[PDB]
Design goal:
By secondary structure, this protein is an alpha/beta fold. An eight-stranded mixed sheet has the order 1-2-4-3-5-6-7-8, sandwiched between helices. It is globular. The chain is built from twelve helices and eight strands. Helix 10 links the parallel strand 7 and strand 8. It binds ligand 8MH and chloride ion. The site of chloride ion has 4 residues, from helix 8. Keywords: Detoxification, Hydrolase. It comes from Rhodococcus sp. Catalyzes hydrolytic cleavage of carbon-halogen bonds in halogenated aliphatic compounds, leading to the formation of the corresponding primary alcohols, halide ions and protons. One of its GO terms (cellular component) is membrane.
């Protein structure tokens, strides 16, 4: 599994800040927009993109405050990410897109899709944010930890002072061992402790046991939209998963219209790190089927 990141940096001004993105593949056709989550960057897509770039433009931004994007003194609420990603998409002049989305990137993508349904041609998603009705529906092995993340004093000590989301949670979200080179690529945006704000605000935004109520409502709304939409859907899942257990993947594969589900084998949260070639290959092939009328 490749450890390099052989993509030239592209930058665009967005709301007075600068955002970094990968941009490879042909200039024409429908672009494929790849959205990462917490605590990753476009690096998480590095072994997926080469499967898609022969046929499609691939655009993979770093969320504001993450990767090579700027780090303004924000709270990095989900609202902030929404504002910056909306502006990012307009700054590149994107019209119609296919979305490839993960974790908080899926919350961004689905919320954008709900508001711009005529511009989304397809959605490939994995380990995505859905409402978690009670803590029992959060995986046991991760319960204590995320409950601690969702406090001000203890959670900030863990995530900001001790960098636990990078040094601990991240490798615990991959079944295979991450190498030192991979770990250094994930560490790079957060070497300065004060820059770790997004890593702490994100788990505090997760829609768990009804809180925070604003995020729960927004996530329910885009899941309702997703259930009503005929847009082509491709769902990757692994065993045991984290956000999406196999039973829920099986349920969604039937409840969501026009949904193809693909089992990647053993996987936790960063499915891209455990089976990039299957995920990349299946996305490339599915993209081709979007042009077959049937
Ligand atoms: C968008 C969703 C992304 C999800 C990707 C999920 O990955 C699965 C996440 O499970 C694994 C999460 N992290 C670790 O184990 C790191 C190691 N670690 C520590 O050092 C520590 C040190 C001091 C106190 C504590 C503590 N407080 N009371 N025990 C509770 C937990 C830990 C801890 C603790 O855990
Ligand atoms: Cl999170």
């Amino acid at each position: 599994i490749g450890t390099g990141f052989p993509f030239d940096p592209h930058y665009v001004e967005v709301l007075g800040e600068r955002m970094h993105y990968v941009d490879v593949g042909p200039r024409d056709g429908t672009p494929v927009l790849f959205l990462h989550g917490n605590p990753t960057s476009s690096y998480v897509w590095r072994n997926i993109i080469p499967h898609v770039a022969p046929t499609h433009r691939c655009i993979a931004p770093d969320l504001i405050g993450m990767g090579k994007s700027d780090k303004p003194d924000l709270g990095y609420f989900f609202d902030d990410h929404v504002r910056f990603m909306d502006a990012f998409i307009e700054a590149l002049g994107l019209e119609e897109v296919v979305l490839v989305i993960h974790d908080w990137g899926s919350a961004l993508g689905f919320h954008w899709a709900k508001r711009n349904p005529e511009r989304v041609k397809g959605i490939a998603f994995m380990e995505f944010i859905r409402p978690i009705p009670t803590w029992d529906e959060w995986p046991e092995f991760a319960r204590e930890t995320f409950q601690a993340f969702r406090t001000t004093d203890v959670g900030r000590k863990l995530i900001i002072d001790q960098n636990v989301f990078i040094e601990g949670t991240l490798p615990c979200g991959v079944v295979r061992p991450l190498t030192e080179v991979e770990m250094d690529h994930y560490r790079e945006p957060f070497l300065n402790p004060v820059d770790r704000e997004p890593l702490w605000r994100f788990p505090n935004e997760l829609p768990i046991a009804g809180e925070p109520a604003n995020i729960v409502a927004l996530v329910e709304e885009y899941m309702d939209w997703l259930h009503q939409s005929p847009v082509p859907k491709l769902l990757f899942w692994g065993t045991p998963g984290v956000l999406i257990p196999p039973a829920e993947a099986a349920r969604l594969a039937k409840s969501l219209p026009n949904c193809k589900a693909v089992d990647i084998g053993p996987g936790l949260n960063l499915l891209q790190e455990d089976n990039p070639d299957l995920i990349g290959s299946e996305i490339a092939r599915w993209l081709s089927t979007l042009e077959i009328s049937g």
